[PDB]
Design a protein around this ligand. Sequence first.
Ligand code: NAG
Ligand code: NAG
Lengths: 58, 159, 53
Amino acid sequence: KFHQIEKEFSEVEGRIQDLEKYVEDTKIDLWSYNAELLVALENQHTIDLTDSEMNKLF
Amino acid sequence: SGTLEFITEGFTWTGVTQNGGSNACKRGPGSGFFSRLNWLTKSGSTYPVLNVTMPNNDNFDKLYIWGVHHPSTNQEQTSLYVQASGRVTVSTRRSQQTIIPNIESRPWVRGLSSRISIYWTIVKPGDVLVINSNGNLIAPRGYFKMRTGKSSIMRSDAP
Amino acid sequence: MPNNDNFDKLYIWGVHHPSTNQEQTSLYVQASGRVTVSTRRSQQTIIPNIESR
Ligand SMILES: *[C@@H]1O[C@H](CO)[C@@H](O)[C@H](O)[C@H]1NC(C)=O
Ligand SMILES: *[C@@H]1O[C@H](CO)[C@@H](O)[C@H](O)[C@H]1NC(C)=O
């Protein structure tokens, strides 16, 4: 990603600023969810496939 | 745009004095001004109605930077532009920006109570730049060539 | 009015818009008023409008 919107503001402007803040705050929350969920699913699967490998050998 | 590539244009400003400067904007020991802007003032005892045109015959968008002077007193206004109330208008075939300067004192900044308002215009190919002024015009010296790219800007104090 | 305190001050002000030229002169003498509020960073100039609403 290259040129993006401003994410920090030195002064109180109003309606447009609130929207810019909201858009970014929204973006971060959605990606933070995706990250948390992904690792949880990957870890559960890793634990299962390793236990599976033991049983296959048995 | 990712560039400050400036191309100078001739612009004929008849009946006015060019290249005005100030001690607030010194270049060397003597006074000066923004290099990309041209401060026009009266010639003798007259400031005529300026009516200049600059066409875009090239295959790109031109970015023009110009301004409007805001004197602190009515005497300042008249000494520079003769007329008690100036006016600046820049236009293209599809758009227009008209501004009447306001005479007003501000808190002293670098020993000055006056200011300049900066404006910008984009001219597409086959379009033309029209500048009309009876006073207070801070004329452009040319244009900046516009680009579409992967460039940006960042605020940081990191080495 | 200078700000010597350690916080931001919010100022609320306004501009009167008379309905007639007679009202304008009766209140403010001059046929056309003007209001300007400024700081070192900002400026707001407003020219009042005379009109029936
Ligand atoms: C910037 O580039 C233009 C290209 O035509 C040239 O005319 C001009 O002299 C250059 N200016 C500087 C300061 O290099
Ligand atoms: C400026 O030049 C244009 C050329 O098309 C002309 O139409 C216009 O009348 C001129 N300005 C004035 C104030 O006459």
